[PDB]
Design an enzyme around this catalytic site. Structure first.
Site, PDB file in Angstrom:
ATOM      1  N   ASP A 154       0.744  -7.851   1.977  1.00 42.81           N
ATOM      2  CA  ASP A 154       0.487  -5.999   1.495  1.00 42.81           C
ATOM      3  C   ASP A 154       2.258  -6.443   1.563  1.00 42.81           C
ATOM      4  O   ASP A 154       2.948  -5.758   2.785  1.00 42.81           O
ATOM      5  CB  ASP A 154      -0.345  -5.822   2.815  1.00 42.81           C
ATOM      6  CG  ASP A 154       0.327  -3.951   2.843  1.00 42.81           C
ATOM      7  OD1 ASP A 154       0.798  -2.733   1.868  1.00 42.81           O
ATOM      8  OD2 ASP A 154      -0.341  -3.777   3.493  1.00 42.81           O
ATOM      9  N   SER A 208       3.526   3.127   8.516  1.00 41.81           N
ATOM     10  CA  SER A 208       3.292   2.430   6.987  1.00 41.81           C
ATOM     11  C   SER A 208       4.270   1.296   5.896  1.00 41.81           C
ATOM     12  O   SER A 208       5.367   2.625   6.107  1.00 41.81           O
ATOM     13  CB  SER A 208       2.571   2.926   6.284  1.00 41.81           C
ATOM     14  OG  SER A 208       0.842   2.964   6.196  1.00 41.81           O
ATOM     15  N   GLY A 209       4.600  -0.012   6.406  1.00 40.41           N
ATOM     16  CA  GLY A 209       5.864  -0.445   5.553  1.00 40.41           C
ATOM     17  C   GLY A 209       6.864  -0.256   6.692  1.00 40.41           C
ATOM     18  O   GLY A 209       8.248  -1.742   5.684  1.00 40.41           O
ATOM     19  N   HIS A 236       0.771  -0.859   0.393  1.00 40.77           N
ATOM     20  CA  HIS A 236      -0.449   0.262   0.170  1.00 40.77           C
ATOM     21  C   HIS A 236       1.355   1.231  -0.043  1.00 40.77           C
ATOM     22  O   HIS A 236       0.402   2.135  -0.098  1.00 40.77           O
ATOM     23  CB  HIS A 236      -1.247  -0.083   1.035  1.00 40.77           C
ATOM     24  CG  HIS A 236      -0.740   0.520   2.594  1.00 40.77           C
ATOM     25  ND1 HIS A 236      -0.337  -1.006   3.334  1.00 40.77           N
ATOM     26  CD2 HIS A 236       0.009   1.335   2.876  1.00 40.77           C
ATOM     27  CE1 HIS A 236       0.327  -0.215   4.356  1.00 40.77           C
ATOM     28  NE2 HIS A 236       0.292   1.334   4.203  1.00 40.77           N
ATOM     29  N   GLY A 247       2.106   6.989   8.695  1.00 43.17           N
ATOM     30  CA  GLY A 247       2.901   7.072   8.208  1.00 43.17           C
ATOM     31  C   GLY A 247       4.410   6.124   8.613  1.00 43.17           C
ATOM     32  O   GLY A 247       5.208   6.587   8.387  1.00 43.17           O
TER      33      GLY A 247
HETATM   34  N1  LIG Z   1      -1.634   0.835  13.169  1.00 40.37           N
HETATM   35  C1  LIG Z   1      -1.410   1.625  12.802  1.00 40.37           C
HETATM   36  C2  LIG Z   1      -2.189   0.789  10.985  1.00 40.37           C
HETATM   37  C3  LIG Z   1      -1.813   2.089   9.600  1.00 40.37           C
HETATM   38  C4  LIG Z   1      -1.401   2.345   8.969  1.00 40.37           C
HETATM   39  N2  LIG Z   1      -1.089   2.209   8.260  1.00 40.37           N
HETATM   40  C5  LIG Z   1      -2.698   3.820   8.509  1.00 40.37           C
HETATM   41  C6  LIG Z   1      -3.275   5.052   8.072  1.00 40.37           C
HETATM   42  C7  LIG Z   1      -4.214   5.278   8.444  1.00 40.37           C
HETATM   43  C8  LIG Z   1      -4.459   5.461  10.378  1.00 40.37           C
HETATM   44  O1  LIG Z   1      -5.361   5.856  11.456  1.00 40.37           O
HETATM   45  C9  LIG Z   1      -3.853   3.866  10.647  1.00 40.37           C
HETATM   46  C10 LIG Z   1      -3.449   3.144   9.869  1.00 40.37           C
END
Ligand SMILES: NCCc1c[nH]c2ccc(O)cc12
Ligand SMILES: [Ca+2]
Length: 223
Positions: free
Chosen positions: A84, A177-178, A40, A175
């Site tokens: 993912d 993410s990844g 993602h 933020g």
């Molecule tokens: N535990 C973090 C999960 C997560 C990954 N990307 C996100 C983006 C927005 C969010 O509210 C949450 C997330």
């Protein structure tokens, strides 16, 4: 990272920042030329930033290297976030040292109860927004599959696990993410998704890296 702590400069040497004019995702360096991240996080024109602590200040240990190729998992489903995971090849090999280092891939899956380290430059608040400039760290256990499926009925596949605290207060966030989930010195997870951040009974959900080791190895050997 919500409810974490300041890691300390270059104490997480496999952590990378993905940059497209600004930090948008984390990743993990797995060898001198390859980065693993979340699918993602895919986009074109990625620059990989290694050796970072403060992502807004040049501090002297950075290596900035453009991506030559990105490979999203063949079975990634953007609606369910199943599979993912994505691989990024660097245009040139990073120079490895004490502050820029690869993280090993797992030989076995980690069990519930194992304590892991999660890190990133994501939002630090569960309501509102405050983004740090320096790398944040969180120690959290892997949760049982039964507690994970009970938190997210009908949404957890065999390629995902939950980690964190059912009480809330501590979690990865937007933020992050990844980014890596590291347990006993092996890469076991990728920050993938959740319902908000740090909410009661809604722990973070992570891509289960041990299921992808053969795909990663075969892909790296042929690209
Ligand atoms: N535990 C973090 C999960 C997560 C990954 N990307 C996100 C983006 C927005 C969010 O509210 C949450 C997330
Ligand atoms: Ca910097």
């Amino acid at each position: 990272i919500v409810g974490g702590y300041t890691c300390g400069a270059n104490t997480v040497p496999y952590q990378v920042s993905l940059n497209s004019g600004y930090h948008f995702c984390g990743g993990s360096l797995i060898n001198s030329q390859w980065v693993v991240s979340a699918a993602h996080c895919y986009k074109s024109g990625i620059q990989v930033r290694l050796g970072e602590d403060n992502i807004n200040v040049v501090e002297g240990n950075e290596q900035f290297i453009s991506a030559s190729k990105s490979i999203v998992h063949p079975s990634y489903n953007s609606n369910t976030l199943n599979n993912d995971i994505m691989l990024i090849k660097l245009k040139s090999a990073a120079s490895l040292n004490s502050r820029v280092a690869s993280i090993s891939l797992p030989t076995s899956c980690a069990s519930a109860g194992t304590q892991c380290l999660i890190s990133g430059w994501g939002n630090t608040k569960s309501s509102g927004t405050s983004y740090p400039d320096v790398l944040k760290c969180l120690k959290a256990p892997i949760l049982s599959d039964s507690s994970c499926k009970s938190a997210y009925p009908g949404q957890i596949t065999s390629n995902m696990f939950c980690a964190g605290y059912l009480e809330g207060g501590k979690d990865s966030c937007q933020g992050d993410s990844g980014g890596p989930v590291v347990c006993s010195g092996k890469l076991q997870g990728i920050v993938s998704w959740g319902s908000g951040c740090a909410q009661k009974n809604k722990p973070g959900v992570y891509t289960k890296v041990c299921n992808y080791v053969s795909w990663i190895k075969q892909t790296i050997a042929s690209n």
